[PDB]
Design a protein around this ligand. Structure first.
Ligand code: 2DQ
Ligand code: 2DQ
Ligand code: 2DQ
Lengths: 272, 283
């Protein structure tokens, strides 16, 4: 017996086996299964992922909410017309504790894997599990965590997963600051200074007609004009995060500490 | 999707091809059975295949791939002898990928097995099981079978694959098939061919030791282990690596009434393994 599912209602499952059965029942009735993974505390960036997923003709949207080791979140999803919320416990996800895991490739040891070297192993492990539980046709992630998104594409590619990975443009505040759950903690002076990250990147992207060095010098100047912004890295790479080619498409990534808050941002760059 | 000829042996090299045929088949309601092999097929593989064949409306996929990542040049390869037997058994799909198609980016994302992988066969081979679980995951994702078949001979490997499948929520049933033996009890293996006639005669000691322990066990674990050791010790040119009695999941738990006795031994340059279910005291 397939667990109950009521079309056009918010259906909330906590059992991995339950969401798996429903997703399979749906896939067999025609629906295209779309997965939006979240650690909850939903914001406009999640709603953008949901609207992207909702656009696909015949979609049923699954939003997972799992804090990788509420009433409001569900209300937000209902207001978006999401049909499934997957909300498992730690024990349901890890009934045998930590055992088999994903070892990311070398990219995980670079950039954000510098301060957090086992972060991405955790992330790719739980993403792989959610993909196997729900078996979506498409999985939606924001572009803010760029290195993570690239490592997920590598996961998908390396383990031959049959899922399209869709990166959705980062939703930003009125002044460009990338949506983040860390932003609410900035005092007004930190919050005014944080704008330098996206200002630096958008300056870089426009300076890039003048080449790579001008793009980087432009970003760096903008960061140098902000007080209390401790830059951990500022790096131009190819879109896959390998070495930036002579000319061509790239990505510019920055990370910085503002008091106790670590902020990240990144942007598409085109050289010359 | 490529040509599939039913009732015929269809050979596919490209992952995308076998993936599409397999998907096509499952939507027609055929159940997809996978027998992963490293080629050089013997009667143990045929038994894996026959088990897969008896699943109703099954279509059977046998994959043949020598994975560089679990090691290599020495390994037995005989694809002429491999595909002939598959046709003879009525297997309809052989999946024979190239190293390039499987590892176009080299080794990058890999499976890190649990701590079982550092024990027994993994002790002196630290990344061996990481290589095995990665290839098995990739084959499962390419073929997406309903059930996958393994022999019980490489028991530690089978337990690790069960872990892989539970730990990554894979939608596949793992089937262990009792180890096929030569008529003296020697466990089928690709490595047997490397035994000279002296060594082949001596090699009966591993299975003799195991069956001895299994009946010795009414008198307890020490008696079972001591009987096995004596049989191994009485055997010419058998150098024992390990001889270990564990719980059936091999894992972070003692032993109850029931478990698994595992032996690895060297005959000249050839390493032989075997194992058996053991019941201690009552059972
Ligand atoms: C063939 O007759 C039909 C087909 C579809 C519908 S419906 O209004 O679009 N509802 C469903 O299709 C539907 C119900 C349903 C229940 C399930 O678990 C109990 C799982 C999937 C279900 N579906 C498919 C869907 O919502 O698209 C109603 C009647
Ligand atoms: C393993 O993959 C995930 C997926 C989602 C999360 S999360 O912590 O719930 N969500 C976010 O991190 C998040 C999503 C998002 C989307 C955006 O635009 C579409 C912009 C920013 C986003 N964030 C940033 C944040 O919340 O810190 C975390 C890890
Ligand atoms: C990664 O998972 C696998 C799966 C199969 C192989 S293999 O080298 O082609 N085959 C075996 O190792 C094997 C299968 C088998 C079956 C048996 O009876 C059912 C008995 C022994 C078996 N072997 C042992 C062997 O060939 O050494 C190798 C690795």
């Amino acid at each position: 017996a397939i667990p109950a599912f009521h079309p056009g209602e918010l259906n909330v499952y906590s059992a991995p086996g339950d969401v798996a059965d429903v997703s399979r029942a749906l896939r067999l009735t025609g629906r295209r299964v779309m997965l939006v993974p979240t650690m909850g505390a939903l914001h406009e960036g999640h709603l953008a992922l949901v609207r992207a997923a909702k656009r696909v003709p015949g979609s049923v949207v699954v939003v997972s909410i799992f804090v990788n080791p509420p009433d409001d979140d569900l209300a937000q999803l209902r207001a978006e017309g999401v049909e499934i919320a997957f909300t498992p416990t730690t024990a349901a996800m890890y009934p045998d504790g930590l055992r088999t895991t994903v070892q990311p490739g070398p990219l995980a040891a670079e950039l954000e894997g510098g301060p957090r070297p086992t972060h991405f192993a955790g992330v790719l492990t739980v993403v792989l599990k959610l993909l196997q539980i729900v078996r979506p046709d498409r999985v939606f992630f924001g572009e803010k965590d760029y290195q993570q998104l690239v490592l997920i594409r590598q996961l998908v590619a390396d383990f031959n997963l049959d899922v399209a990975v869709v990166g959705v443009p980062t939703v930003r505040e009125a002044d460009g600051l990338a949506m983040s759950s860390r932003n609410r903690y900035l005092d007004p002076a930190q919050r005014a200074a944080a704008v330098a990250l996206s200002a630096a990147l958008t300056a870089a992207a426009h300076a890039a007609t003048a080449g790579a060095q001008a793009a980087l010098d432009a970003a760096r100047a903008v960061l140098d004009a902000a007080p209390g912004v401790a830059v951990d890295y500022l790096e131009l790479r190819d879109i896959g995060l390998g070495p930036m080619p002579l000319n061509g498409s790239g990505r510019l990534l920055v990370a910085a500490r503002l008091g106790t808050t670590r902020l990240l941002d990144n942007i598409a760059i085109e050289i010359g």
